């Protein structure tokens, strides 16, 4: 997969993934891979927006060759920033985030791994994954960039989690 004749190349190839699982629990598949801006729109403009997905569902957009699981070599020493959103906000947030990621707005060298939008029962969750959780200059820069590129509600909690780090929870 290479950019075509007069397309606009990207800094990396990326791969779209989709998953549907159950809470409390191979269920993750590749949708397609792109090498240019025009090719990205060719996938993305024909995809269901995360705000119209049903179930316990996620879209993942990752650098080609990185699997959206933490055990992956590029992910095992990393972490993610997490933003929890009310229903109605995820689709616009996901678009602004993937356009920022693709256009190289983060400026953190090779640290970015990919992004996930997670549809849950009563909230959506957007995350961005990076290589090195202990790299405070990188995670600080990622946090600030998210604030520059997303229109978030005031009061919005952002939270970093390293991957290695009453009744049962039934709905989510």
């Amino acid at each position: 997969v290479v950019p075509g004749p007069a397309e606009h190349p990207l800094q990396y190839n990326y791969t779209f993934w989709y998953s549907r699982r159950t809470p409390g629990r191979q269920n993750i598949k590749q949708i397609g891979t792109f090498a240019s801006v025009e090719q990205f729109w060719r996938f993305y403009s024909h995809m269901v927006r995360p705000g119209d997905l049903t179930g316990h569902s996620d879209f993942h957009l990752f650098k080609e060759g990185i699997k959206p699981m933490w055990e992956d070599d590029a992910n095992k020493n990393g972490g993610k920033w997490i933003i929890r959103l009310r229903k109605g906000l995820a689709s616009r947030c996901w678009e602004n985030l993937i356009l920022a990621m693709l256009g190289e707005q983060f400026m953190v060298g090779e640290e970015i791994c990919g992004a996930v939008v997670s549809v849950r029962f009563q909230e959506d969750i957007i995350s961005i994954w990076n290589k090195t959780a202990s790299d405070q200059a990188t995670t600080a820069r990622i946090r600030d960039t998210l604030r520059r590129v997303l229109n978030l509600p005031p009061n919005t909690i952002m939270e970093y989690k390293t991957h290695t780090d009453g009744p049962q929870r039934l709905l989510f």
């Binding site: 190349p9 403009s45 920022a100 400026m107």
Partner: peptide, 16 residues
Amino acid sequence: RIIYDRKFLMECRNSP
């Protein structure tokens, strides 16, 4: 590094 502004990226959406 290959850097794209959001405006530019959006404008490409109308190019086949």
